[model samples]
Target: MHEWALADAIVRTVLDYAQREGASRVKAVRVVLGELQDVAEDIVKFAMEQLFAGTIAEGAEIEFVEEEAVFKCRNCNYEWKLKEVKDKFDERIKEDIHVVHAFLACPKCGSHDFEVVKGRGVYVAGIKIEKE
Candidate 1:
């Protein structure tokens, strides 16, 4: 599963950071999810708990935040959010929001030539650690 793979990578990254910072324990982990990324928080949390066992981040608090995605039309320079036209795309369309614009169009000019200014990627926002 992609969620499991992502969770594994997250665990590794957290542990690596903790070691670099000389942290005795990880207090919290903050992860940001892009609105277009179809990731499940529950699965990620479960995977993290499983992978963090016997590690410094074993009991660290996990937090998730979803970033909103906005698209701007090149033709008319109109901007809109994913939530506004989310119903138009199907399962596959959501996965490749960056590559293809066939499933989406500018509500103003009806053009697909637009750029996603936000909410197209995912990353760890921050991590809190205990030095002692």
Candidate 2:
């Protein structure tokens, strides 16, 4: 799945940081995942596990944290969270919204112009490493 690409990037970032810090090995990684991204944790976990072989991050404990999605309307300047209107969209529409954020609009102005204020995607929050 495309989550594999995300995992690849995450692994690379972790390894790069480990190298820069002169870490002998990585012990854990904390990832903050945005809710709107709809990324599957299982896929990312499996991919990362497969990719970590023989690297500083090998056997590292991975933690995935979910961040609530928040959006701000450009039309009315209204802000809201995904959970506030998630019930309005069906499963199919919700899935589509993940790909095309335009599927959602400003609740106040009904305009299809809104910007995500928070919870956009995954980011490495912290990493635990061992120094030689």
Candidate 3:
């Protein structure tokens, strides 16, 4: 998935930056992930483990802060959490299917045309490293 690639790129970039800053080893990284991005956190972490081997990022811990999707109604200027709207329809769907659909709607005006005001992506928040 694109997110995995992006995550890998981000990790590598961070490590490179840290090394350039005179860090000997990266201890941890904190990333903020948007809900609408649909990134698989576990997969990204696994990828990091594989890619960091023998690199400055080796043994570094990765953590994610999940951001909730916020939608602003185009017509009504109403803003609300997208999950609140999707949860209603999700209740009628099959249990397993609910998980996939429970975060895909707008609660304010019920308009799918609402703009994503927040939580549509991810970014590295901070990194902890050991300096020489």
Candidate 4:
């Protein structure tokens, strides 16, 4: 699962930071996950727990905040939220798969070229570590 890989990356990053900063361990790992991805939260948590089995972050809580993925039209400079345009399609479930490079046209002008403005992907927002 991709979540497994993500979990590995997160644990490695936290461990690296803790070592470099002289921290004892991580208490929690917070992430900002974009709505455009919409990955399963439970799967990620499970993966993290498994990946942390022997690391300093073993008991660290992995928290994710669902962030909005905004879309902007490159042609007319029109901006919109992901849900605003995806709902217009007859098969929105399938449309969500490519919402980042959506087939949505600009409301101001009928141009399909668009750029992602915010929350386009997942990222580690912050982490809390236990002071030595």
Q: Distance from true position, residue 14, model 2, in Å?
A: 0.6
lDDT tens digits, residue span 1-132, model 3: 776787778777887889789988888888888887867778888887788888878888788898888989899999999778887767767555533233555656555555667867899988868988
C-alpha local distance difference test of each model: 0.87, 0.86, 0.78, 0.78
| Residue-level lDDT tens digits of model 2 in 81-103 | 98768676666576675544345
**Regions of model 3 farther than 4 Å from truth:** 88-132
In model 1, the runs with Cα more than 4 Å from the true position are 73-77, 87-132
Give the RMSD in angstroms, all C-alphas superposed, for model 3.
Answer: 14.5
Question: Tens digits of per-residue lDDT for model 4 on 44-123?
Answer: 88887887788777788777898898988899999999776766774767666645333576667667777888856999
Clashing pairs in 1: none
Candidate No. with top TM-score: 2
Clashes of each: 0, 0, 0, 0
Q: TM-score for every candidate vs. truth?
A: 0.59, 0.63, 0.57, 0.62
- Superposition error at 104 for model 4 (Å): 32
Kindly provide the TM-score of model 3 when superposed on the true structure, using C-alpha atoms. Answer: 0.57
What lDDT tens digits, residue by residue, belong to model 1 across residues 1-132? 889998988999999999999999999999988888888889999999999999889888899998889899999999999876766666557677553344788768869678889968999999967996
